[PDB]
Amino acid sequence: SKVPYYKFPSVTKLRIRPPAHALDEAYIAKYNLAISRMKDLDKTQPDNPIGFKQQANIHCAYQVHNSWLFFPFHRWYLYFYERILGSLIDDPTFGLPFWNWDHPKGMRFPPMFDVPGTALYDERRGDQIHNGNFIDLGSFGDQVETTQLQLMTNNLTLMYRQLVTNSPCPLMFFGGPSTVEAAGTVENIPHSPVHIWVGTRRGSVLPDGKISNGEDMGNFYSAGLDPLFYCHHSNVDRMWNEWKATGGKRTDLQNKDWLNSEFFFYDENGNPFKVRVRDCLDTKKMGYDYQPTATPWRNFKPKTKASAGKVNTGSIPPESQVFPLAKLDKAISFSINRPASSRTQQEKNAQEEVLTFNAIKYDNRDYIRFDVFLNVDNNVNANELDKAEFAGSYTSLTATATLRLAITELLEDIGLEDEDTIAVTLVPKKGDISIGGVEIKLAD
Ligand SMILES: [Cu+2]
Ligand SMILES: [O]
């Protein structure tokens, strides 16, 4: 090969990635100009690596997904993508905006992307994105079944569960290192539902005609053909920064195999380079940062319980009697034993208590979603996620996958810390789902 490693150029001012909503019209104007000139290369220089289609093919070429390589790959991906945009308009400080879908003011479709006849527009998008509707951060392809207020409440609860509760340590945030999918918190939710919510409905008839397969954002191979793809991933990249902001155990993976993993990218001059994961840990050392923006989901630890008291775990079947579960056709409840109870804080400091669902199997072309609750029964209202019992959710953009949930916070809030056995309830929302086994392990 002999391709050199990337040399960081000299860094003048920091590039500032701003929120996509209510951006000034002059910013939108040159963002459209950069994209327009990127798309022109599809015609004038189809094999130029910086052109629109060739950049889209980076996602459609790159096992980088459902692994701990998810965040660093897309950071480097967007790093060169942002540099290409700035260089096409002679703007060396151009910042790639981020779709602020974790903030109530950024949860609508960003207006700048919905202007037909502009370079940022894409007709291959779904219909539920208009009419001033809020995004559904737990979308599985259907229309929202709740009020917009409950939708907002669920969105912010999902953010809290995904950025705080279920990502207390690096491996659960970034993902894991076979066909078993080991996605982290964010790559599952809200990353996957945003793709689903923006894309066309699978089975629908596309522009002209083809049966849509979810193009553009809702299908993995064509997602890069929507300019909004990069704006979404800008906020995904921002989630990495916001996750580390509170310190403690939420730091970068220190494993040498992860740090020294390499990717391949062409820079804005069309020159090939190898890049290391260890060299993208600090965005400011790559020449960019995010505009400081409030994160109100940090305050959405649920304050109420769905059900008072404790479930009688003797009236429900044990995990050993339910799994392997051939089909999660409806809500089911089961008891499960904990490795230890009455844990001290020094034990919690060492090992997280993790509820793990093993061998989630389904057809990778179907929309999949199920929710997990502790200490409820089969009649739990799964539309109300702002409850102390809501643990998390699994979704999918035959596949085999794993879901891991950090439950120490819930055990404290619900009052189950001295219990050796607890109740778990699975609520399916979409798809044909089988589950091989469920366990509570004390992890890293
Ligand atoms: Cu994505
Ligand atoms: O992605």
Numbering used by the authors: 35 to 96, 109 to 223, 228 to 447, 459 to 505
Paste lines from the article:
The active site region is composed of a typical four-α-helical bundle harboring the dicopper active centre, where each copper ion (CuA and CuB) is coordinated by three histidine residues.
SlPPO1 was crystallized as latent apo- and holo-enzyme (without and with copper). The structure of the holo-form lacks a large part of the N-terminal domain (model starts at Ser35) leading to the absence of two highly conserved disulphide bonds (Cys11-Cys27 and Cys26-Cys94). Despite these gaps, especially that one between the first and second CuA coordinating histidines (His93 and His111), the electron density of the active site region indicates an intact dicopper centre. The two copper ions exhibit low occupancy values (CuA = 0.3 and CuB = 0.1) which might be the result of copper loss during the X-ray diffraction experiment. The presence of an ‘oxygen moiety’ between the copper ions suggests that the enzyme was crystallized in its met-form with a CuA-CuB distance of 4.2 Å, which is in accordance to the met-forms of other structurally known plant PPOs. The position of Phe270 is significantly shifted in comparison to the gatekeeper residue position in other plant PPO structures further confirming its high flexibility, which might have an impact on the catalytic behaviour of SlPPO1. Comparison of the gatekeeper residue positions between the apo- and the holo-structure reveals a significant positional shift, which is only possible owing to the absence of the thioether bridge in the holo-structure. The Phe270 residue of the holo-form would sterically interfere with a present thioether bridge.
